């Protein structure tokens, strides 16, 4: 819980993105013309009162003071959304000199700052889009062996969704092979965007090719996440590191939110909207409420702030 | 064998047309843009020379300068003059070198010199250079030139008729074009000056007694821009040598 | 830059719509397509020869690849649009 | 074809566009004006207006597309680009565009081609033998046909100005290094109205040679 | 780069030597 500060840089050479400093006297790093990269830096509040004094001389910047004791992801973007009255943001960036031990931040993307430069734009929307994040397991289906949509206007508000600009994220815990199965019984490949497998487990990710039968187009979903907390317990949350990195794989580059949609709460790690899913092994049709649900997550900023 | 092809669609297959084109004739008019505006920027070049040369006190023709051989001062200034232009050509940056530099006109037979009429004696203690006015006006003696005359082409159908349908010291012409016999005689001792500036001695045993492979190098020397080669089939008959 | 003549900002609408109605009749026969044919020729045909007069590279591959490139139907139902219940 | 009313919708969108041209003091036949010197204020004037026109139907909801704008036309090949005869710049607060008018004029040139053999509808002695039993104003294909073409132009350049207009000048030089941000792209927010834009309505490609 | 302040180190003192005399 702490104070925190923020740049904002005169002239956006580069726009959206930000930085995270752990010294003031860090810029020397980043030295002539670097810094030109870069729309906000936050930095944790001084505690010398001579640092923000040269701040407050300093006219090479804007910049903005405040309190964030809420030490979370989601909830200091929202602060400096509000503070610069902006929906959509860029990617944190990170440098070989490490970061503050702000490591409560630790789930997140890390950009390493040169890639900056070489960084694309995407076709994909025209828009900055929202997101949202589905399984498999008890989601969506009906529970049993074969399975009915919840609703066919479910199935069809899933195609209508592409109107709002928004992007489809499954993500299965459940393994791997019955998934194609799954799609020829009821495809949704014209009707949904990303897929993922094989998340149901946190393994051993420490230092000590597919689509044989029919020519699919996907991917090793490769185990690439970090055992992350070093502890016991049971948890495996959904991952921003890995969506973020495949979206941007996929080139999507910015967003205005993202939400999950999932029977656990306990992987929800900080996401803007949870949908615990209610379990059902027939035919609900209850989606309108759902629908209600995601509408007004949505709408959330239509006030430009999302409360 | 590059005859594109070309094809529209509309939506769910209403309708789909095909059409098909060359691009022969499209590299005609790439080639003619490009020689011609090529050509401009050399003969702008070459005026912006002679206007520069203009500011001289030219109270005479520049024949007559050479024709008289009582004074070497007004020869001096335009050798250096040239120099230097030929300097900043190849270096997009106003210089001033090594500040003593002198010359010897070799004003007679028994000092004259097989090919080269110039030689850079590099540092006698400093730079020197020799001056054969007596070849100079020897050259300058022109009278070879008039312009009225005939020129290779071929397969004008394909090649060139497609060519045929494109478009006080108030001094003539024919002087200016004498002009660039020194400017190439110029430039072919700023290689070997530089050449040497830039080396030892010992390989004129090579360049001098034939400069040829002095290419290799200058391979990676030049400044990624060229000089005055733009007629490159440069050539006479070889094989009558008749060893 | 002196080409301008700003802040003539009309919203125009001029609906005439009875007579242009008609107007728009005389028109009807003429093939869509097949007019539609010669503009998209006549556009690629100038675009190309530009690269040529600049002594250009040019992406055969990226121009198709970018402009006019065509999308799917992946419903299987239909949605609202626009029109007039005219009269 | 059962899509024929969406066809006719096409043609009543073209037909709304002629009408504001006609309505919008046009003075003369546009190909004259194009080659004539002075005017250009006119035509760019007429520009701004169609860009408008594209907006309003693009994204009706608020009627302000822009309020002033900024413009050059250029006579000069060599202060021009391949591909994209119209361009945006930004100078210090001086948003402006830019256009070459000979580009333009030749394109408009070139509209020779008419009728070569396509399917066709339904000749009939009931249809017309039962006619001839019994029972200004004009505008010629070609005629109509140069004002879709010209207005067909500015889609690349609208595009292009969105685009720009929300994501600044290096985004705007990243799309012209590399347009394929249209590349199959109607997804967007509903008032966008990306889908009733011509990208869908039709397609086209080089038939690859080599 | 992690070179480059070094780099410019380097030349601040190259300056910080020549300027004054």
């Known amino acids: 819980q702490s104070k925190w500060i923020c740049l904002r840089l005169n002239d956006a050479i580069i726009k959206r993105h930000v930085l995270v400093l752990s010294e003031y006297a860090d810029l020397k790093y980043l030295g002539f013309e670097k810094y030109?990269?870069?729309?906000?830096?936050?930095?944790?509040?001084?505690?010398?009162?001579?640092?923000?004094?040269?701040?407050?001389?300093?006219?090479?910047?804007?910049?903005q003071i405040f309190k964030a004791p809420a030490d979370d992801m989601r909830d200091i973007r929202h602060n400096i959304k509000r503070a610069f009255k902006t929906p959509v943001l860029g990617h944190m960036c990170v440098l070989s000199n490490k970061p503050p031990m702000y490591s409560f931040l630790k789930e997140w993307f890390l950009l390493p700052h040169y890639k900056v430069v070489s960084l694309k734009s995407e076709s994909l929307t025209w828009g900055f889009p929202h997101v949202v994040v589905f399984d498999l397991d008890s989601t969506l289906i009906t529970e049993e062996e074969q399975v009915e949509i919840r609703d066919p206007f479910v199935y069809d508000s899933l195609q209508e969704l592409h109107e709002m600009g928004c992007v489809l994220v499954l993500?299965?815990?459940?393994?791997?092979?019955?998934?194609?199965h799954?799609?020829?019984?009821?495809?949704?490949?014209?009707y949904f965007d990303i897929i993922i497998s094989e998340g149901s487990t946190v393994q051993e990710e420490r230092s000590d090719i597919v689509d044989y039968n029919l020519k699919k187009r996907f991917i090793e979903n490769k185990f690439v996440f970090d055992i992350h907390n070093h502890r016991s317990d049971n948890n495996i949350p959904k991952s921003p590191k890995i969506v973020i990195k495949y979206l941007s794989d996929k080139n999507v580059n910015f967003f205005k939110s993202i939400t999950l949609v999932d029977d656990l709460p306990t992987n929800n790690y900080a996401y803007d909207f949870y949908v615990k899913v209610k379990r059902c092994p027939t035919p609900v049709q209850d989606w309108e409420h759902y629908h209600n649900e995601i509408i007004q997550n949505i709408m959330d900023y239509e006030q430009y702030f999302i409360k | 064998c590059n005859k594109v092809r070309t094809v529209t669609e509309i939506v769910n297959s209403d309708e789909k047309i095909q059409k098909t084109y060359e691009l022969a004739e499209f590299d005609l008019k790439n080639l003619s843009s490009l020689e011609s505006y090529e050509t401009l920027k050399i003969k702008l070049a070459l005026s912006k020379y002679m206007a520069m040369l203009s500011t001289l006190e030219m109270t005479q023709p520049l024949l007559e300068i050479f024709r008289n051989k009582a004074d070497t001062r007004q020869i001096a200034a335009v050798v250096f003059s040239t120099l230097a232009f030929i300097h900043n050509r190849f270096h997009p940056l106003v210089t001033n070198f090594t500040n003593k530099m002198e010359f010897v006109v070799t004003e007679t037979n028994?000092?004259?010199?097989?090919?080269?009429?110039?030689?850079?004696?590099?540092?006698?203690?400093?730079?020197?250079?020799?001056?054969?006015?007596?070849?100079?006006?020897?050259?300058?003696?022109?009278?070879?030139?008039?312009?009225?005359?005939?020129?290779?082409?071929?397969?004008?159908?394909?090649?060139?008729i497609a060519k045929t349908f494109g478009a006080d010291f108030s001094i003539t012409?024919?002087?200016?074009?004498?002009?660039?016999?020194?400017?190439?005689?110029?430039?072919?001792?700023?290689?070997?000056?530089?050449?040497?500036?830039?080396?030892?001695?010992?390989?004129?045993?090579?360049?001098?007694?034939?400069?040829?492979?002095?290419?290799?190098?200058?391979?990676?020397?030049?400044?990624?821009?060229?000089?005055?080669?733009?007629?490159?089939?440069?050539?006479?008959?070889?094989?009558?040598?008749?060893? | 830059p002196?080409?301008?003549?700003?802040?003539?900002?009309?919203?125009?609408?001029?609906?005439?719509?009875?007579?242009?109605?008609?107007?728009?009749?005389?028109?009807?026969?003429?093939?869509?397509?097949?007019?539609?044919?010669?503009?998209?020729?006549?556009?690629?045909?100038?675009?190309?020869?530009?690269?040529?007069?600049?002594?250009?590279?040019?992406?055969?591959?990226?121009?198709?690849?970018?402009?006019?490139?065509?999308?799917?139907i992946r419903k299987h139902s239909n949605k609202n649009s626009n029109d007039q219940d005219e009269l």
Request: proline share 3%; aromatic share 16%; hydrophobic share 35%.
């Open chain 2, 110 to 160: 028994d000092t004259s010199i097989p090919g080269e009429p110039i030689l850079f004696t590099e540092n006698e203690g400093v730079l020197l250079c020799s001056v054969d006015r007596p070849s100079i006006v020897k050259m300058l003696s022109r009278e070879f030139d008039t312009e009225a005359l005939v020129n290779f082409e071929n397969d004008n159908c394909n090649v060139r």
């Open chain 1, 171 to 180: 993500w299965s815990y459940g393994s791997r092979d019955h998934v194609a």
């Open chain 1, 182 to 190: 799954s799609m020829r019984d009821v495809d949704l490949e014209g």
């Open chain 2, 173 to 243: 012409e024919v002087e200016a074009t004498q002009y660039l016999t020194l400017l190439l005689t110029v430039e072919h001792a700023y290689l070997h000056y530089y050449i040497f500036k830039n080396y030892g001695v010992f390989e004129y045993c090579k360049s001098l007694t034939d400069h040829s492979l002095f290419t290799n190098k200058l391979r990676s020397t030049m400044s990624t821009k060229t000089s005055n080669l733009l007629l490159s089939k440069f050539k006479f008959t070889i094989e009558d040598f008749d060893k």
């Open chain 3, 2 to 72: 002196q080409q301008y003549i700003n802040s003539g900002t009309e919203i125009p609408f001029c609906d005439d719509a009875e007579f242009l109605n008609r107007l728009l009749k005389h028109i009807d026969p003429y093939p869509l397509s097949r007019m539609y044919y010669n503009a998209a020729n006549t556009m690629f045909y100038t675009t190309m020869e530009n690269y040529a007069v600049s002594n250009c590279k040019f992406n055969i591959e990226d121009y198709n690849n970018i402009f006019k490139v065509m999308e799917n």
């Open chain 1, 36 to 63: 030109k990269f870069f729309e906000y830096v936050i930095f944790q509040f001084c505690n010398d009162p001579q640092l923000c004094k040269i701040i407050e001389n300093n006219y090479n910047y804007c910049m």
